Symmetry: D2
Subunit: 343 residues, 4 copies
């Protein structure tokens, strides 16, 4: 039962990250992010993104989305996003809670990526009608929930659509490092250079304990996010224990190394499974998330052998396999050999 | 730099950070599905001598707002003290989670609620559709100024909530500091007095960010679970919040850390009150001291590297907060520096 | 000009404005304490053949938002059609009153929910703390596309709500148009089918602004009474909202206005459908008609002075809505003008 | 049968008000304020207040207060008002609901007014503190709930405080005309000349049915008030029947005449009572609201004779008497004669 591909949050934290917390719990520090360790992490993130920004460390990626969307969306506003996006399905209405009831309008798109024409139509729809909610913000997940990745030309176009229609762009980066490692571009080209204004920098699924970051590029919303982070109960007094994780998460490119390894194990797992006759991939994997089609008997037999994964959410035969930074080749190859015998 | 500003400046106890290292191995079911979250819940059931449900949260203000949101309707009112944490230092976190409930201040001394004023506030404009209806009460134990409710005052507040059909929530951010001074069992300070939901605090008493919502009336379990997730306070890697709480309760570490913090405040106040120009404004009950000093003493102590809060309550008024990590040398140093400036 | 945009452009019925002048004499107890508001409620108890509770509101959007808010928790979900009014033309009024409840669109043909698609959306991710919990269903009768739920279709939805622990709300802004086309009793259309709260619409059928929240499950009476006051929908001089509803129901005037509106729509649809280039999306059931016209014909009718809503649902799709004041000459003028354009 | 002085909401409309809705009935009109009568009413208020403004007709004065405060106050903001204000007591948290949970902070003051020193102290309190809500808006009631009337000097002083502290000033004017008639000033001097940004122009208590007006002087919140009026359910389709009330309300100075009559019948009622030996006035009468002390037996006898009033909400023997536009000199003389016989 120890071989699981349900999610990347089942894994523990990196040894370098837990040791940073043990080295941080020394002496006294000014609470609520006014310490020296938090200032170093914000300055380090500025050099990584090659621009000025403001750090808002939060304990949950869902809170990183809800606080970000609340600073940009008025209660009468609308948040354009994908139907399968995380803010629309697996947050228990956390955006609707923080935005004081702003509506989330699902926009058509393939492979978890917003279609540019469908986004422009949704943005201009009923603009000027007092009887309708007004689209103000667009949310894109990078990497997407279905294991796909926006390319640089796909991100730049969405940003331009936001510019032309007066919309704000928020990037859900719970698996940000997986998309960055698969493209090899700089973090700036994948964020603010493409038009992203607020970024939900995710680190928990990539090796941290709970240290998530709201990376704000448009500092005009700084007062909003700061007040809304405290108002939501996400301003921790002993902040240095969340910035200790992020400091080790960014040191020596540990975050890039962890994400690269997770993407390799997923490509190895998808290669071994798609080679089977009765198994097919819904799309070639680009991150650490795999969506494949297996015969229904193969799903039940694999779960009966101890393998844990997510099924029966996206239809019949659809199985989601997610690797982590701590996934070993033995775990991947064992899952391949087990499904091969059933084939 | 010797500081008595608050207990949130200290780190965690060495056992707390080490229990996370042991929990940092292997894979575990996320969002509280691990056996460690089940253990700390079963451990808290044995401590409070009753059945309960645990909801770990990162901050104590989140524990308050989530607890109050499960008990208070939007058209309801939360009866609390004027100087309470939920009414001042949360940026309207209760008003946010409760979908706009109204916090009504109730008169009282030393951050405590007066039973007469509470009864008059609970019965004000009952049945009137034009006014918000009182529904819940919030008390802080120990209070924001370090005062401690007696078990007899908690029973009276609890009986008022039963007579008026209200719900009782306790802000236990410094729960351990009040429990050690009373020497009573946790059950007598909570559900035996009538407390329905408890914000079990541990951060100030030696944890990194382990706060707990202790629900005694399990009829609100579905609302707390949904609102904690809806508010973004449901962490995936729960075993790292549970590992802090496991070491926090193991071998009575929380009772020892609190007894040490309360004891260090007693020595600091007794040594300062022995000075001619230094007097105590209120008797020290937990780990928060309120004393009066000469204005030159305050500036001279802050030039030497001593940190504390002063202007927030008056001229010459100085607040000193000791934590589990304040040493006997740090207490005697601040006293000797004040004695020289005397 | 001759307009078929909506039935809210119409005047007030002469009997409605007459009743307001008959009620502007003397004093009366405010906020519904008068004898006229109590008479209108008792008059509705006899019409619906059951005990109920009346909550007069100035707007049908508020009637939907207040009703759904009393039934939905903030972490809950409202199951409705994609083209429903609460999901399109209320500026998030349900999301506002419900403190951010998520409106989930359920598949359905001709603006009517599919029973098999509704039962799947209710069971979907039940027990998942990460997902919003479906709590209520909202069906519009008559619907926005001009269709009408039959009695067997209303009872099936009511059974699915009872099977999945859901609460049923009925949007009845054009409730009378659906009742007159079926000829059944108001009880058979509402609570007998399983409806728990009804947005009884009267403005579009000849009233100025007297909308009514008819509550059959009186356990939510306290919620609605507090939420319409909390939303600013509790008028002091309510005897002038109940004066409209009294004349609205007097001598079956509301049934006479609705029957006339449906007959004028059947006349308009018959003449247009007989034309060569004009097609009906579906046969008309209420006072609302959706038809397909050539693009040149639409602009030509707009250039002659005729008013209707277009380019909101597609190319060539035109919505024509008749009112109680629509004359046969206005209808025959629109038929003759569109016929000349062929 | 019963001669009541409970409030001015028990009365009906002026004859001109109900006759105006009958004339605005005939014909078809564009809904949701698109008709010509709603525009003409807005044009009249531009001439009455001698400035450019925007009109938002609402059914209740609580809706006028809550919608106005929601446009000015952010969710983390704070509303400064009096403890006994209508928004803090008799609206069932309507301001808290429309503002998405903004806090209402009570400011000390006498006769329902705000003290300038206590207001500056509440505005400067805990500025820049992220843990505390930030004061953003001020709300004053003219005339106050106890019938007291702000002077023009007191109104201008509060306005400069709002400008010195970056605050927005909203005025609750449910009995606006009662205060305007006694001061004898222009409507502009009472509102925007003193710094009022949005006004809850009240008319129901002065002879209307439900024609309450949100008058916006700072049209930067125009888009926000329109969205918040519709989102709250206060955008009526057949608005030509709310503006028809307001057209007759403003025609031929009917609103000034009704308010003067209400203030006159109150001054006559207070003069005849204070002359009696056993009933005294607690405060000088300024508008249509009176406060007087009576022995307990006189209250019970007046209650058994049919007279209606509030008698135990403020103290021992404290009786509040409220006159309206429909109060006659026969109704005033009858109440005084009955109380004189009891004396």
């Amino acid at each position: 039962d120890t071989v699981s591909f349900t999610s990347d949050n089942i894994a523990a934290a990196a040894p370098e990250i837990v040791q940073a917390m043990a080295q941080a719990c020394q002496g006294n520090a000014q609470p609520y992010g006014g310490d020296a360790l938090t200032q170093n992490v914000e300055a380090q993130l500025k050099a990584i993104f090659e621009c000025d920004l403001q750090l808002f460390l939060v304990p949950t990626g869902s809170a990183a989305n809800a606080i970000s969307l609340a600073a940009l969306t008025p209660p009468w506003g609308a948040i354009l996003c994908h139907q399968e996006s995380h803010i629309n399905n697996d947050e228990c209405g956390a955006p609707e809670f923080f935005t004081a009831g702003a509506k989330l309008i699902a926009v058509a798109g393939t492979h978890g990526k917003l279609d540019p024409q469908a986004l422009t139509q949704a943005a201009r729809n009923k603009r000027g009608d007092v009887h309708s909610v007004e689209p103000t913000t667009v949310s894109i997940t990078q990497a997407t929930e279905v294991g796909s990745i926006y390319a640089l030309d796909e991100l730049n176009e969405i940003g331009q659509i936001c510019r032309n229609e007066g919309l704000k762009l928020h990037m859900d980066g719970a698996r940000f490092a997986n998309a960055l490692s698969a493209l090899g571009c700089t973090p700036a080209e994948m964020t603010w250079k493409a038009g992203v204004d607020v970024l939900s920098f995710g680190a928990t699924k990539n090796g941290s304990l709970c240290a998530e970051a709201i990376i704000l590029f448009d500092k005009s919303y700084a007062q909003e996010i700061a007040f809304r982070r405290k108002r939501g109960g996400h301003l921790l007094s002993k902040m240095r224990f969340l910035s200790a994780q992020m400091h080790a998460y960014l040191a020596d490119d540990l975050w890039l190394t962890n994400a690269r390894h997770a993407n390799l194990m997923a490509a190895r797992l998808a290669a071994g499974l798609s080679a089977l006759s009765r198994v097919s991939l819904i799309a070639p994997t680009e991150s650490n998330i795999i969506f494949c089609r297996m015969p229904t008997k193969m799903i039940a037999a694999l779960q009966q052998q101890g393998f844990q994964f997510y099924h029966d959410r996206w239809g019949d035969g659809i199985v989601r396999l997610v690797t982590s930074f701590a996934t070993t080749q033995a775990q991947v190859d064992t899952f391949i050999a087990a499904a091969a015998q059933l084939n």
